[PDB]
Design a protein around this ligand. Structure first.
Ligand SMILES: [Zn+2]
Ligand SMILES: [Zn+2]
Ligand SMILES: [Zn+2]
Ligand SMILES: [Zn+2]
Ligand SMILES: [Zn+2]
Length: 124
């Protein structure tokens, strides 16, 4: 903060002597730098006071990544297969044995099941 003047008359707001005649937002900035292209680059970083605290001038805090190797901004477990709790693209269930099937039994109770030529394909 370090303000010698603090205000021209009102004694309670961020607009010092030469700041008070200008339409400067109540704690954003100084009229020496604060402008319609420079509003976020002035005295304070956010809703909390000054750029003058915390490393990287108090950056915005994202909700972090769901993965623990990946750290920054991107994706979720359904978009990142590269974690051992996700499913693999191998050894999944599929069809087998693409060949013709065996023949059926029909052999008149004399040489298998029941069916053919029983009039003469008989001995006893
Ligand atoms: Zn004032
Ligand atoms: Zn502003
Ligand atoms: Zn801050
Ligand atoms: Zn990941
Ligand atoms: Zn037979």
């Amino acid at each position: 903060k370090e303000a010698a003047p603090k205000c021209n008359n009102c004694s309670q707001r961020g607009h010092l002597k030469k700041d008070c005649p200008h339409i400067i937002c109540s704690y954003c900035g100084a009229t020496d730098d604060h402008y319609s292209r420079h509003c976020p680059k002035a005295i304070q970083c956010s809703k909390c006071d000054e750029v003058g605290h915390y490393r990287s001038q108090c950056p915005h805090k994202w909700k972090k990544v769901q993965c623990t190797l990946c750290k920054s901004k991107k994706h979720s477990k359904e978009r990142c297969p590269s974690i051992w709790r996700a499913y693999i693209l191998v050894d999944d269930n599929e069809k087998a044995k693409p060949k013709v099937l065996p023949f059926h039994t029909i052999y008149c109770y004399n040489c298998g099941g029941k069916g053919h030529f029983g009039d003469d394909c008989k001995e006893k």
